[PDB]
Amino acid sequence: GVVISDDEPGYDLDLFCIPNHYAEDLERVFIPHGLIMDRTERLARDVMKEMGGHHIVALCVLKGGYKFFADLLDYIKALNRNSDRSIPMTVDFIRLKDIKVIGGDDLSTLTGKNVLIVEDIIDTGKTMQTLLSLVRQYNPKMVKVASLLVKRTPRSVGYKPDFVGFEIPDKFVVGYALDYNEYFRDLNHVCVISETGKAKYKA
Amino acid sequence: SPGVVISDDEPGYDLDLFCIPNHYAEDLERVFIPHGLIMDRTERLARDVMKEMGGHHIVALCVLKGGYKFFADLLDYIKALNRNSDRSIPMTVDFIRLKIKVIGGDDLSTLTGKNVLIVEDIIDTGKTMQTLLSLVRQYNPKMVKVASLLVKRTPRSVGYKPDFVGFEIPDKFVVGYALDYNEYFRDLNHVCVISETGKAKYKA
Amino acid sequence: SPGVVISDDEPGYDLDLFCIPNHYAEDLERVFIPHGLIMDRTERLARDVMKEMGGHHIVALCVLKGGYKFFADLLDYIKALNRNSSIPMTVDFIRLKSDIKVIDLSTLTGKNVLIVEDIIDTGKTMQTLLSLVRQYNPKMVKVASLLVKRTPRSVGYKPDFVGFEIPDKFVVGYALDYNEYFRDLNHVCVISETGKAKYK
Amino acid sequence: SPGVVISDDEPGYDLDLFCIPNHYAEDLERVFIPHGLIMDRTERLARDVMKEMGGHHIVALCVLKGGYKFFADLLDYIKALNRNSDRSIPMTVDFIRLKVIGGDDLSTLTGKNVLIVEDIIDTGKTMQTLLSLVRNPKMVKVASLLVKRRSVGYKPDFVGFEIPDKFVVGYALDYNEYFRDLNHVCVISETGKAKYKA
Numbered sequence: 001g002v003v004i005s006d007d008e009p010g011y012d013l014d015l016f017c018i019p020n021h022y023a024e025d026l027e028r029v030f031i032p033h034g035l036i037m038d039r040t041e042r043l044a045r046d047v048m049k050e051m052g053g054h055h056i057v058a059l060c061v062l063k064g065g066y067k068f069f070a071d072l073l074d075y076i077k078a079l080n081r082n083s084d085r086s087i088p089m090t091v092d093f094i095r096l097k098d099i100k101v102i103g104g105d106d107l108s109t110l111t112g113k114n115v116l117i118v119e120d121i122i123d124t125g126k127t128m129q130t131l132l133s134l135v136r137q138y139n140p141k142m143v144k145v146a147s148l149l150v151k152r153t154p155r156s157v158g159y160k161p162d163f164v165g166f167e168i169p170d171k172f173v174v175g176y177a178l179d180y181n182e183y184f185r186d187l188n189h190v191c192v193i194s195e196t197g198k199a200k201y202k203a
Numbered sequence: 204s205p206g207v208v209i210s211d212d213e214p215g216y217d218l219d220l221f222c223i224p225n226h227y228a229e230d231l232e233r234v235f236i237p238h239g240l241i242m243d244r245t246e247r248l249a250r251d252v253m254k255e256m257g258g259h260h261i262v263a264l265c266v267l268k269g270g271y272k273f274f275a276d277l278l279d280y281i282k283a284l285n286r287n288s289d290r291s292i293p294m295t296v297d298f299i300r301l302k303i304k305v306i307g308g309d310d311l312s313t314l315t316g317k318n319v320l321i322v323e324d325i326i327d328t329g330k331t332m333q334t335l336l337s338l339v340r341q342y343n344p345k346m347v348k349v350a351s352l353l354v355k356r357t358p359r360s361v362g363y364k365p366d367f368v369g370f371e372i373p374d375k376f377v378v379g380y381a382l383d384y385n386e387y388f389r390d391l392n393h394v395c396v397i398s399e400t401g402k403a404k405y406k407a
Numbered sequence: 408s409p410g411v412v413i414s415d416d417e418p419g420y421d422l423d424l425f426c427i428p429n430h431y432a433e434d435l436e437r438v439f440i441p442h443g444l445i446m447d448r449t450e451r452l453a454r455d456v457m458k459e460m461g462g463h464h465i466v467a468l469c470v471l472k473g474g475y476k477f478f479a480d481l482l483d484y485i486k487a488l489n490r491n492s493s494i495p496m497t498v499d500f501i502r503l504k505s506d507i508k509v510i511d512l513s514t515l516t517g518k519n520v521l522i523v524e525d526i527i528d529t530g531k532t533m534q535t536l537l538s539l540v541r542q543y544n545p546k547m548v549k550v551a552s553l554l555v556k557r558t559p560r561s562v563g564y565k566p567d568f569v570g571f572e573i574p575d576k577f578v579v580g581y582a583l584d585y586n587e588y589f590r591d592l593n594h595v596c597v598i599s600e601t602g603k604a605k606y607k
Numbered sequence: 608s609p610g611v612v613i614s615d616d617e618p619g620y621d622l623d624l625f626c627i628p629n630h631y632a633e634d635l636e637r638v639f640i641p642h643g644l645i646m647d648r649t650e651r652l653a654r655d656v657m658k659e660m661g662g663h664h665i666v667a668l669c670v671l672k673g674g675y676k677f678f679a680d681l682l683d684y685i686k687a688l689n690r691n692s693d694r695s696i697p698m699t700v701d702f703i704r705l706k707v708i709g710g711d712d713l714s715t716l717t718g719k720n721v722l723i724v725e726d727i728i729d730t731g732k733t734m735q736t737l738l739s740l741v742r743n744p745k746m747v748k749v750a751s752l753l754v755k756r757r758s759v760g761y762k763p764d765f766v767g768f769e770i771p772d773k774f775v776v777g778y779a780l781d782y783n784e785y786f787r788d789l790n791h792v793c794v795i796s797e798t799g800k801a802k803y804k805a
């Protein structure tokens with residue numbers, strides 16, 4: 001994936017269009033929306049090259065997964081209608097919130113199927129451990145994992161997704177559906193929160 | 204406005220004039236609402252939402268599964284206004300699924316005293332919507348509004364009208380733009396009507 | 408093949424259902440082809456061009472000014488296809504204005520040329536253009552026009568690629584003008600007669 | 608604003624991290640500025656243009672050929688601004704090539720807010736000539752996607768990116784007419800430079 005370095009300074013907010021209501025709440029733009037798009041376009045092709053023979057169930061991990069999920073699937077849809085290659089897709093949504101699971105339940109749709117799990121970020125890798133444990137209970141034919149972000153953290157068990165958008169430093173990022181206490185999901189760029197932001201939006 | 208009126212005698216478009224996924228080439232009969240028309244209409248709807256809810260925080264409630272495409276696009280159009288004006292609608296997002304079984308039901312307590320925009324793919328009998336409204340109302344939100352991409356002209360037992368409507372359509376079964384037939388056709392950008400071979404292939 | 412056919416009795420859409428620049432609000436009658444529909448049609452056209460001319464080098468020739476939007480989007484869709492397993496492209500621009508006047512075409516020589524136009528009406532412009540272009544000796548010439556107007560005032564011209572076939576009404580938007588106005592409008596619309604009076 | 612500053616030591620991106628035109632696979636070395644970044648910056652530039660020029664009728668002048676992509680995208684963002692706030696002004700367009708080749712009469716620029724749209728400013732001699740010609744418009748401003756750091760000291764009013772003294776192609780910028788059909792700003796490889804050599 002795209003490696004973002006520890007000393008990556010990001011961009012000044014005044015160079016980009018940002019939501020009026022978060023103008024004072026962000027410190028820098030970390031990953032511009034357009035960069036996320038470009039990288040996701042390539043990821044869609046990588047997904048096709050890998051899982052292209054088969055019908056796939058795309059499993060969206062809510063809430064933060066929703067933007068990456070819709071965009072990735074859209075790029076995949078563009079391939080399906082303009083190429084000879086093909087991945088017929090059905091979709092499913094799951095939420096993990098010590099980790100409670102909502103919406104599976106459900107989920108025999110996964111049995112004997114090719115599963116593409118779609119996540120916003122891998123940090124400790126624990127959420128993903130909980131998910132795979134539940135997916136195992138339905139006996140899928142194949143499981144692949146795509147994550148927009150993978151965080152470089154010593155708190156990691158060492159788990160790595162098949163498809164990675166960006167490998168990022170051990171910093172807390174928001175935007176592109178990633179939240180701080182449910183705020184900042186309504187933001188297209190991945191960014192870092194300012195001092196004012198932390199205090200204003202703290203729980 | 205009651206949205207864009209698609210006539211009862213609308214023929215739709217020959218599949219050959221559009222790019223459609225090859226795996227559905229035999230399973231569809233006509234494109235009924237082109238993806239791009241949906242986007243154009245959704246852009247206007249975001250501006251309508253901004254005019255009616257602007258300068259206020261909203262909880263945007265996505266009704267899975269079929270609502271997910273309209274939800275993402277509408278929110279993207281709203282975000283475009285948010286970052287290009289000094290008028291702004293700060294938004295938080297939530298998800299719910301109705302299947303009548305309700306899934307994801309315990310973030311509904313959090314709606315108390317809030318402004319809620321429910322986002323749906325379609326209103327047919329209206330029973331899903333009425334069920335969902337009464338559920339939200341149990342938690343006393345300050346305000347509830349409903350946006351629905353499609354509303355069918357069909358007899359309804361109550362005369363409910365959503366606040367924002369993309370298109371008013373004939374009483375025909377449509378698929379695409381996340382609307383399904385037995386989970387198929389969600390991976391299709393256009394709204395379409397299904398062929399007889401489509402109905403048979405994917406019949407549950 | 409004759410493209411998306413828009414009927415003579417087509418009502419179009421009420422302006423109030425779309426986002427439209429305020430400065431054109433009272434000057435338009437209806438929306439005829441929503442920007443997004445233009446996009447969806449142009450995506451298929453890209454694939455049609457890739458099917459006909461694929462695997463070979465192409466000069467894409469933009470006919471200014473009205474052709475510029477269709478040209479940009481059509482090429483963007485072709486480039487999208489090119490990022491998958493290819494039509495290498497160079498580009499050029501030409502303007503014809505009406506006696507029809509022209510505004511170096513040596514590039515075209517021995518190449519496969521795709522002329523990109525906004526609209527064919529009488530077909531005069533296109534005969535004028537093909538006449539000149541063929542004098543620079545290209546290997547092949549194909550013509551894409553977003554719009555072709557159904558008219559008794561015919562030569563006419565059948566382009567190889569056609570977006571929409573429309574009624575004999577004066578349209579503006581998506582870079583087509585009325586007296587240089589309305590190019591900054593993303594939808595194709597029918598101009599009002601009261602609208603025509605406002606832009607001289 | 609000097610725009611988004613791209614340093615001299617900016618390495619850019621490995622080609623395999625992005626979707627690249629198949630036919631340019633060996634002809635490029637690095638992605639230098641991703642298309643998505645260009646779009647993000649252009650969106651902001653659009654709002655900057657409207658903040659300054661949106662008070663009166665704008666004539667947008669496209670400098671062919673390399674300016675065509677930037678021009679199209681910039682105006683679409685401007686059109687988006689103009690159709691989502693109840694305040695707007697008409698905008699007309701023209702096209703020129705710099706030898707000045709083939710726009711409308713320059714008297715169409717009188718009394719208007721003229722916006723010149725360029726792909727790149729290097730020395731800046733070209734623009735200085737055009738500017739010292741275009742002049743009684745109500746106002747003239749220049750938007751350029753790229754500005755290089757042997758200049759004669761001209762700076763445009765709106766800058767997308769400030770780049771090193773490197774030769775770049777893509778987003779309609781060419782090497783001998785090639786590479787215009789490329790969405791990213793990139794750097795040519797040795798293979799590329801000699802394959803399309805003049």
Ligand SMILES: Nc1nc2c(ncn2CCN(/C=C/P(=O)(O)O)CCOCP(=O)(O)O)c(=O)[nH]1
Pocket residue numbers: 061062063064065096097120121122123124125126127128151171172173174178179180
């Ligand atoms: N917004 C944000 N959230 C972060 C980040 N790192 C971990 N998290 C917490 C995400 N959580 C932990 C990931 P791990 O691999 O350690 O199990 C996942 C669950 O988040 C639920 P939701 O998407 O917010 O509804 C971060 O950099 N930004």
Ligand SMILES: Nc1nc2c(ncn2CCN(/C=C/P(=O)(O)O)CCOCP(=O)(O)O)c(=O)[nH]1
Pocket residue numbers: 266267268269270301302324325326327328329330331332375376377378382383384
């Ligand atoms: N794809 C499609 N589905 C249709 C249609 N009409 C009803 N439905 C079924 C949707 N249902 C009924 C709406 P009502 O107002 O009658 O209570 C709700 C379906 O939601 C389940 P999901 O979005 O497929 O996960 C239709 O035209 N197309």
Ligand SMILES: Nc1nc2c(ncn2CCN(/C=C/P(=O)(O)O)CCOCP(=O)(O)O)c(=O)[nH]1
Pocket residue numbers: 470471472473474503504505525526527528529530531532533556576577578579583584585
């Ligand atoms: N905007 C607009 N223009 C129309 C229309 N019909 C003919 N025209 C005239 C186009 N003209 C001739 C077409 P024909 O096949 O009859 O030779 C050429 C347009 O002029 C060049 P530009 O693109 O406006 O700079 C129309 O419906 N809308």
Ligand SMILES: Nc1nc2c(ncn2CCN(/C=C/P(=O)(O)O)CCOCP(=O)(O)O)c(=O)[nH]1
Pocket residue numbers: 670671672673674726727728729730731732733734773774775776780781782
């Ligand atoms: N493609 C490319 N071209 C570069 C570059 N630097 C200068 N140029 C030369 C561009 N030239 C002017 C530079 P000045 O110093 O006078 O401000 C103009 C050439 O443009 C002709 P066209 O757009 O290809 O039709 C570069 O990095 N890439």
Ligand SMILES: [Mg+2]
Pocket residue numbers: 061062063064065119120121127
């Ligand atoms: Mg997650």
Ligand SMILES: [Mg+2]
Pocket residue numbers: 064179180181
């Ligand atoms: Mg979280």
Ligand SMILES: [Mg+2]
Pocket residue numbers: 266267268269270323324325
């Ligand atoms: Mg629904």
Ligand SMILES: [Mg+2]
Pocket residue numbers: 269383384385
């Ligand atoms: Mg359903």
Ligand SMILES: [Mg+2]
Pocket residue numbers: 470471473474524525526
């Ligand atoms: Mg023309």
Ligand SMILES: [Mg+2]
Pocket residue numbers: 473583584585586
């Ligand atoms: Mg004209």
Ligand SMILES: [Mg+2]
Pocket residue numbers: 670671673674725726727
């Ligand atoms: Mg130039």
